[PDB]
Design a protein around this nucleic acid. Sequence first.
RNA 1: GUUGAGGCGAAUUCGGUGAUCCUCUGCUGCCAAGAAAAGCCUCUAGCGAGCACACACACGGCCCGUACCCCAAACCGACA
RNA 2: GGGUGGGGGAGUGAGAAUGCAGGCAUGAGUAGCGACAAGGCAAGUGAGAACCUUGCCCGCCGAAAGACCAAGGGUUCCUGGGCCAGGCCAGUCCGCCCAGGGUGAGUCGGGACCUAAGGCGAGGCCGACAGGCGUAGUCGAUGGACAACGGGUUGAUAUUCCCGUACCCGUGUGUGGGCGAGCGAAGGGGUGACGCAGGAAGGUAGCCGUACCAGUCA
RNA 3: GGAGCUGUCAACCGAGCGUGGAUCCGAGGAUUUCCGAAUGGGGAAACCCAGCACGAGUGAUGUCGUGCUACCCGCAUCUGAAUAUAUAGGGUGCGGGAGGGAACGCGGGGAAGUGAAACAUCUCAGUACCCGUAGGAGGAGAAAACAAUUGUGAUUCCGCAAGUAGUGGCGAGCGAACGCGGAACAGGCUAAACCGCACGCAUGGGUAACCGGGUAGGGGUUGUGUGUGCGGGGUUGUGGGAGGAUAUGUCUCAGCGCUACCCGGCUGAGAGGCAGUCAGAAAGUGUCGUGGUUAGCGGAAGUGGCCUGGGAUGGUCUGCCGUAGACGGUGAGAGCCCGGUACGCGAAAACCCGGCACCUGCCUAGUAUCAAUUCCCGAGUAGCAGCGGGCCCGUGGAAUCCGCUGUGAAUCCGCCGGGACCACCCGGUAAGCCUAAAUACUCCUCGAUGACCGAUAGCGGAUUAGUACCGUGAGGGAAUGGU
Lengths: 62, 95, 68
Amino acid sequence: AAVCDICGKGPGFGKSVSHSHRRTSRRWDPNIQTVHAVTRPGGNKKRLNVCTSCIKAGKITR
Amino acid sequence: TLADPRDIILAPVISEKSYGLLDDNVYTFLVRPDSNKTQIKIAVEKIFAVKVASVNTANRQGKRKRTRTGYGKRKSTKRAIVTLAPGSRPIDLFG
Amino acid sequence: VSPGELRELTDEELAERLRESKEELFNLRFQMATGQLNNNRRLRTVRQEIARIYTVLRERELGLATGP
RNA sequence: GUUGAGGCGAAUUCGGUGAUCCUCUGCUGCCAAGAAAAGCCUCUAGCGAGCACACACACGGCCCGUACCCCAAACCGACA
RNA sequence: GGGUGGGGGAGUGAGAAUGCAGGCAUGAGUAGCGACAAGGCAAGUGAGAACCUUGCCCGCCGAAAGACCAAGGGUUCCUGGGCCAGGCCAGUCCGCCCAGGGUGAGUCGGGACCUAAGGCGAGGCCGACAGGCGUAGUCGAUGGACAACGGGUUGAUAUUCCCGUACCCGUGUGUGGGCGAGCGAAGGGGUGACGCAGGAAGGUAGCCGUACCAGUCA
RNA sequence: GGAGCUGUCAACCGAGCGUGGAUCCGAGGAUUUCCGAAUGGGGAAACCCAGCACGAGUGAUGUCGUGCUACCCGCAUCUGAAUAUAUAGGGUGCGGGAGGGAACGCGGGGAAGUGAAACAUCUCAGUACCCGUAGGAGGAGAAAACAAUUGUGAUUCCGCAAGUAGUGGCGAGCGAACGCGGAACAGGCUAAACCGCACGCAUGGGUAACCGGGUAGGGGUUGUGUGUGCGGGGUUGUGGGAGGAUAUGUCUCAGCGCUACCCGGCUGAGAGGCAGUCAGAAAGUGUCGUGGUUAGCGGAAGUGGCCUGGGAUGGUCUGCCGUAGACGGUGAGAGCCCGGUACGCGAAAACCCGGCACCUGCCUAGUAUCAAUUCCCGAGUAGCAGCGGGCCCGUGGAAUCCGCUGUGAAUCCGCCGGGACCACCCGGUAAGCCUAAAUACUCCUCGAUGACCGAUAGCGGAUUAGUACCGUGAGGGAAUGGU
Ligand SMILES: [Mg+2]
Ligand SMILES: [Mg+2]
Ligand SMILES: [Mg+2]
Ligand SMILES: [Mg+2]
Ligand SMILES: [Mg+2]
Ligand SMILES: [Mg+2]
Ligand SMILES: [Mg+2]
Ligand SMILES: [Mg+2]
Ligand SMILES: [Mg+2]
Ligand SMILES: [Mg+2]
Ligand SMILES: [Mg+2]
Ligand SMILES: [Mg+2]
Ligand SMILES: [Mg+2]
Ligand SMILES: [Mg+2]
Ligand SMILES: [Mg+2]
Ligand SMILES: [Mg+2]
Ligand SMILES: [Mg+2]
Ligand SMILES: [Mg+2]
Ligand SMILES: [Mg+2]
Ligand SMILES: [Mg+2]
Ligand SMILES: [Mg+2]
Ligand SMILES: [Mg+2]
Ligand SMILES: [Mg+2]
Ligand SMILES: [Mg+2]
Ligand SMILES: [Mg+2]
Ligand SMILES: [Mg+2]
Ligand SMILES: [Mg+2]
Ligand SMILES: [Mg+2]
Ligand SMILES: [Mg+2]
Ligand SMILES: [Mg+2]
Ligand SMILES: [Mg+2]
Ligand SMILES: [Mg+2]
Ligand SMILES: [Mg+2]
Ligand SMILES: [Mg+2]
Ligand SMILES: [Mg+2]
Ligand SMILES: [Mg+2]
Ligand SMILES: [Mg+2]
Ligand SMILES: [Mg+2]
Ligand SMILES: [Mg+2]
Ligand SMILES: [Mg+2]
Ligand SMILES: [Mg+2]
Ligand SMILES: [Mg+2]
Ligand SMILES: [Mg+2]
Ligand SMILES: [Mg+2]
Ligand SMILES: [Mg+2]
Ligand SMILES: [Mg+2]
Ligand SMILES: [Mg+2]
Ligand SMILES: [Mg+2]
Ligand SMILES: [Mg+2]
Ligand SMILES: [Mg+2]
Ligand SMILES: [Mg+2]
Ligand SMILES: [Mg+2]
Ligand SMILES: [Mg+2]
Ligand SMILES: [Mg+2]
Ligand SMILES: [Mg+2]
Ligand SMILES: [Mg+2]
Ligand SMILES: [Mg+2]
Ligand SMILES: [Mg+2]
Ligand SMILES: [Mg+2]
Ligand SMILES: [Mg+2]
Ligand SMILES: [Mg+2]
Ligand SMILES: [Mg+2]
Ligand SMILES: [Mg+2]
Ligand SMILES: [Zn+2]
């Protein structure tokens, strides 16, 4: 997964550049991690894939 | 907005086979192509006030016809061949 | 028939005259098929009259010009 | 008998042979080990004060195809 | 619709590009006229006949060159007309042209029943997007289930129309007596339900004779 | 509108209609099979099969008609599995989406042939194409801007600046900006600080408060702090509010913050003023226009003589109109024959436009100064590091801008920019949103035009034309005008 379910952050598109400066397309995927998030304490878990930026923030709970 | 059977039944077929069947009290009608035997039965029974023994239907493709602008098809038709009860009164078709 | 003169027909004889228009279109159709009517304008006229009756009947229950 | 259409209309028994067909979705052999679902039957869950059954009568049976060509002059090959 | 002159502007000049389009030559009245079954006579029709019609001879196929179904085609089917195109000739004929007509189902082949492979696929999972895959489900016969036979009839349809005789599903109304059982279709279970090869036995169709019947006297 | 008409290939007929106003033209409505996003379910598009409800029909099954019945999203309600809180899910009711469209827009993905006389950097080209997604336009837009000592002051677009500075296997090539001249101009709304109201959470009973401030008593625990909602308030870069003090002031009335007094506050209503269909808030009903669009109507002046001719619109004498000598038709070059033209009128209704009302919203309490003790300015953001992208900049000392990864601030005695960086100085206030006009485009509707074509041309298409025909299919795709 390369899309965050909270902030919608997706992959960027750019180039891998060789020493000969040949540039081929590649992606910069967000650091998407699976979380089992809860809405209220003790509640049912829901599987999301969110970026480590949202995990570092308080956007999700476990 | 109320429907009636005089619009399911379009016209009688006039042909030598039609007359041959008229001799034995069997009448062939041009009917609306989307109709079925049962509404033909009910329709004839309440239009001509007769007892319909059986209705036989045949779908007939329109004749394809050459013409100076191209080929055109005639209407596709549906005959209903209606045989009345053995003793029910003949319908008066006026010709 | 005319739209004005088919207004004095109230609610049910208007449908009943639609019924006789349908019946006469039937018979006129049959004499078309058997070739025993001379003036073929009659079924155009009758079809137009059926349309007129249907139109007026639709206006009356859509909410226009109703009345006996 | 426009040689159309009619009307009448005999005998039809006993054998032989004999299937690619039936008994046979059987039998036997084999290994490579040979659909599903509906349908039908049955069970109960359930429904149930009315039922099942017989016979007689009277009815309802829908939609689509149906012409014609098919080792072809009408299908595939530009062609009868 | 033009001419001339002062100017202005060009899709302004073709003989070639194995150039492009159309028309028309040359080859040439030449090759060919599509199987090695094979035609003939008489009569007819007709302006016109090798080819059409009729009759009769002769020949050819006959595990098809016969009769059917499916797919495919689409009116080519029948009748009546037509004959300058088409048919490898001609054509009076025609699958050509024109008009009219013609295809009748509770049981046939399909659907309204069932599912296979596979397809689509609620939600769903996955995937930057596009989208991929797929559950439930729903389609999908080439298979499973399911009730009609014989004869006649039209120019053209017939297991469809008609006759005779059936069978299947459903509906209503009566009568009789019986039970106050009866219906159970969620689900369960059984069946459905299955390969290949090989006979044998009992049979039947068909076929060949035959009792008998009816016609013929070359 | 006013006498013919029943469209056209396309003649023949047949049968009729029309001054009791047809045909025809404009507007609004009615009907509107089946398919198609197609959406009850299914399907080989235009077909098949339903369920429910209400009717019609039958003796009853058959049968007919009309509605509703896809999925997803949002909102609101009911219920709340495993499992308790609960949630997932499910039920119901309202709304909405889906698909299409010639071009123009924005964001994202993104070639190659080609050029470099090879080729990989580079080019082609952010082109083609694709994805998402609009709107009548869009995007941008209100300074973390430029500039450089006086400055300009949102954005867009046009012309320059300039093929310049630069950038480039410094090759092929690529290529700004500052600033100047124009078109058009327009600015606004959002948190907190802080303040009330309601909900939830924590703490205490004379600890304390609290009951609008002061004055006295009374009540004798519903205060205080906090998170969540509603409001106010504020929205700025000369930095932008409170919280206090000091003066000055409250349009009227009724009710309220324990009571009595002064002051004051809150609500409501009236009154007054302001604004409005808008970016800055949002809908509705009447009335009226010298209004405009969708039909149309009137509109001058030669039967002129002779000639040629089948025909005069030609020639040649003459007569006229002209706000009309545009154009076309009419038997050959017609201002005066016809349709018209100049010009002048014209609209039931619908739509558009505008006005007046009605309506809705805002204000009626603040102001000024002092002082700077306190708090406020939008975060996983900026910055920094890595890897990329983009700018003239092809990573270079790489500034500004964008993406991902890691790390990760501070709230003005902050932070960002001014081409590494530092100091000073100057400029500006990022991480929220909205915003007209000038700009782009033409499937389509009118009105014109052409030193454009004139049937091998001009559209592929004057003609069955995206037809015939060809292809399984995507696709390709003609020819044919003139009595
Ligand atoms: Mg995702
Ligand atoms: Mg990129
Ligand atoms: Mg490249
Ligand atoms: Mg980050
Ligand atoms: Mg029958
Ligand atoms: Mg049938
Ligand atoms: Mg023909
Ligand atoms: Mg035998
Ligand atoms: Mg047949
Ligand atoms: Mg052939
Ligand atoms: Mg042959
Ligand atoms: Mg010349
Ligand atoms: Mg000249
Ligand atoms: Mg010149
Ligand atoms: Mg030239
Ligand atoms: Mg030449
Ligand atoms: Mg040449
Ligand atoms: Mg040639
Ligand atoms: Mg020779
Ligand atoms: Mg020869
Ligand atoms: Mg031959
Ligand atoms: Mg002869
Ligand atoms: Mg032989
Ligand atoms: Mg043999
Ligand atoms: Mg024939
Ligand atoms: Mg014939
Ligand atoms: Mg001929
Ligand atoms: Mg010939
Ligand atoms: Mg889905
Ligand atoms: Mg799938
Ligand atoms: Mg499946
Ligand atoms: Mg099926
Ligand atoms: Mg099958
Ligand atoms: Mg036959
Ligand atoms: Mg029978
Ligand atoms: Mg098995
Ligand atoms: Mg045997
Ligand atoms: Mg009209
Ligand atoms: Mg209309
Ligand atoms: Mg559908
Ligand atoms: Mg569908
Ligand atoms: Mg619970
Ligand atoms: Mg759209
Ligand atoms: Mg390249
Ligand atoms: Mg090169
Ligand atoms: Mg080269
Ligand atoms: Mg905008
Ligand atoms: Mg300027
Ligand atoms: Mg707030
Ligand atoms: Mg006029
Ligand atoms: Mg005039
Ligand atoms: Mg003229
Ligand atoms: Mg003129
Ligand atoms: Mg970085
Ligand atoms: Mg860069
Ligand atoms: Mg800020
Ligand atoms: Mg801002
Ligand atoms: Mg904006
Ligand atoms: Mg604009
Ligand atoms: Mg324009
Ligand atoms: Mg135009
Ligand atoms: Mg052309
Ligand atoms: Mg084809
Ligand atoms: Zn995230």
